[PDB]
Amino acid sequence: MNELYQLEKEPIVGAETFYVDGAANRETKLGKAGYVTNRGRQKVVTLTDTTNQKTELQAIYLALQDSGLEVNIVTDSQYALGIIQAQPDQSESELVNQIIEQLIKKEKVYLAWVP
């Protein structure tokens, strides 16, 4: 079963707004994810063996975890919000997974973007 979320087109009036951020140093694999909210709450967690993509997603997860039943979340990561947006499209994820499975089984493959 493909369970779907519903997002608001505008901020929820009166709801806590979490400004979330995350970053992972490419060399140490050590990242920090966290938020500051309009109501003056702040949290910063540390993640071991992580990537930029994962910490940015983690920051959103934290906000969802620590927020009430109504919540506004502003991320500085286009990537994280993009992953979430694409999640409901089961067909696309299948297509992409099947490409990757094909790539795995090839003995040699040159794959390149040529403008």
Can you give the three-state secondary structure of 33-100, one letter per residue?
EEEEECCCCEEEEEECCCCHHHHHHHHHHHHHHHCCCCEEEEECCHHHHHHHHHCCCHHHHHHHHHHH
> Taking a C-beta distance cutoff of 8 angstroms, is the pair 19, 39 a contact?
no
Angle at 77 between CA 11 and CA 16, to 5 degrees: 30
3-class state of residue 105 by DSSP = helix
- Please give the domain boundaries of the chain with CATH numbers for all domains: 17-104 (3.30.420.10)
Residue 81 phi, psi (nearest 5): -70, -30
Going by the DSSP 8-state scheme, the letter that residue 12 receives in this structure is P
Torsion sign across C-alpha atoms 7, 10, 12, 18:
positive
- The β-bridge partners of 22 are 33
CA dist., res. 111 & res. 5, Å (int): 35
Tell me, in Å, the resolution of the deposited structure: 2.0
Going by the DSSP 8-state scheme, the letter that residue 27 receives in this structure is T
Structure tokens that stand for 55 in this block = 């910490």
Residue 47 phi, psi (nearest 5): -125, 135
CB neighbours of 54 closer than 8 A, spacing ≥ 6? Answer: 22, 24, 31, 47
Q: In angstroms, what CA-CA distances link 91 with 52, 99, 100?
A: 26, 12, 14
Place of tokens 């979430």: 84
For this PDB entry, the determination method is X-ray
CA dist., res. 58 & res. 1, Å (int): 25
